[PDB]
């Protein structure tokens, strides 16, 4: 009789891969079948992976995601029983870019900047960082970018005042999670060419409003 594979054991091998191994059972196993799924899913949603050796690498997994898996051996009698179930979480990976930058332009020197959360957070987002700087026409920076420091970096909007009139700026936003910073979303805009709309600001502490010429 083919026994259950023994000491099933899984470890994350990145954000998108898990290595799962086990000890061969007694009884002339000819190979193994691994079933794996996202913790919470059903077993018609389970993936089935064959292997000829007592380990596999699971691939094309979701970052920062709990998986469940188990493995059986097969041989002359067919399939033996499955191992006990093991769980393992993939690593976080940096988020994707934030959503496209939205500018609500108030005046020739003031604009609100906002953005959607990254389509793939690949973890929990703990901060955004906004940078901005003067550019010419080739998106060529004129001097250094500035980075904005704020009390609550999880907010997805900023008010920027005292920008240089009739001058284009590049703005970037990136997001951070436990794995670090992802790619930036960039936009280049000159407030002079934008239609203006007034906005209301509550007179309260901690409004995230930044002076562009510190
Ligand atoms: Cl990976």
Curated annotation (Swiss-Prot):
Function: Integrin alpha-6/beta-4 is a receptor for laminin. Plays a critical structural role in the hemidesmosome of epithelial cells. Is required for the regulation of keratinocyte polarity and motility. ITGA6:ITGB4 binds to NRG1 (via EGF domain) and this binding is essential for NRG1-ERBB signaling. ITGA6:ITGB4 binds to IGF1 and this binding is essential for IGF1 signaling. ITGA6:ITGB4 binds to IGF2 and this binding is essential for IGF2 signaling.
Residues of the Fibronectin type-III domain: 4-93, 97-196
Subcellular location per the Swiss-Prot or TrEMBL entry: Cell membrane; Cell junction, Hemidesmosome
Complex formation: Heterodimer of an alpha and a beta subunit. Beta-4 associates with alpha-6. Interacts (via cytoplasmic region) with COL17A1 (via cytoplasmic region). Interacts (via cytoplasmic region) with DST isoform 3 (via N-terminus). Isoform beta-4a interacts (via cytoplasmic domain) with DST (via N-terminus). Interacts with RAC1. ITGA6:ITGB4 is found in a ternary complex with NRG1 and ERBB3. ITGA6:ITGB4 is found in a ternary complex with IGF1 and IGF1R. ITGA6:ITGB4 interacts with IGF2. Interacts with TMEM268; this interaction prevents ITGB4 degradation.
Modification after translation, per record: Palmitoylated by DHHC3 at several cysteines of the membrane-proximal region, enhancing stability and cell surface expression. Palmitoylation also promotes secondary association with tertaspanins.
Name of the protein: Integrin beta-4
Organism: Homo sapiens (Human)
Entry comment describing in which tissues the protein is expressed: Integrin alpha-6/beta-4 is predominantly expressed by epithelia. Isoform beta-4D is also expressed in colon and placenta. Isoform beta-4E is also expressed in epidermis, lung, duodenum, heart, spleen and stomach.
Medical condition linked: Epidermolysis bullosa, junctional 5A, intermediate: A form of epidermolysis bullosa, a genodermatosis characterized by recurrent blistering, fragility of the skin and mucosal epithelia, and erosions caused by minor mechanical trauma. JEB5A is an autosomal recessive, intermediate form in which blistering lesions occur between the epidermis and the dermis at the lamina lucida level of the basement membrane zone.
The family this protein is said to belong to: Belongs to the integrin beta chain family.
Domain notes: The VWFA domain (or beta I domain) contains three cation-binding sites: the ligand-associated metal ion-binding site (LIMBS or SyMBS), the metal ion-dependent adhesion site (MIDAS), and the adjacent MIDAS site (ADMIDAS). This domain is also part of the ligand-binding site. The fibronectin type-III-like domains bind BPAG1 and plectin and probably also recruit BP230.
């Amino acid at each position: 009789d083919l026994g259950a594979p023994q000491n099933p054991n899984a470890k994350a091998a990145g954000s998108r891969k898990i290595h799962f191994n086990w000890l061969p059972p007694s009884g002339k196993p000819m190979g193994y079948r691994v079933k794996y799924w996202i913790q919470g899913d059903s077993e018609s949603e389970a993936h089935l992976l064959d292997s000829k050796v007592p380990s596999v690498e699971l691939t094309n997994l979701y970052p920062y995601c709990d998986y469940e898996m188990k493995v059986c051996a097969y041989g002359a009698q067919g399939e033996g029983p499955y191992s006990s179930l093991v769980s393992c979480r993939t690593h976080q990976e940096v988020p994707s870019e934030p959503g496209r930058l939205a500018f609500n332009v108030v005046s020739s020197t003031v604009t609100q900047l906002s953005w959607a959360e990254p389509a793939e957070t690949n973890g929990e987002i703990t901060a955004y960082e906004v940078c901005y700087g003067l550019v010419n026409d080739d998106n060529r920076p004129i001097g250094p970018m500035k980075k904005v420091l704020v009390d609550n970096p999880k907010n997805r909007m900023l008010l920027i005042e005292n920008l240089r009139e009739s001058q284009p700026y590049r703005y970037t936003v990136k997001a951070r999670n436990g794995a670090g910073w992802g790619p930036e979303r960039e936009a280049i805009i000159n407030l002079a060419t934008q239609p203006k709309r007034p906005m209301s600001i509550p007179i309260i502490p901690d409004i995230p409003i930044v002076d562009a010429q510190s």
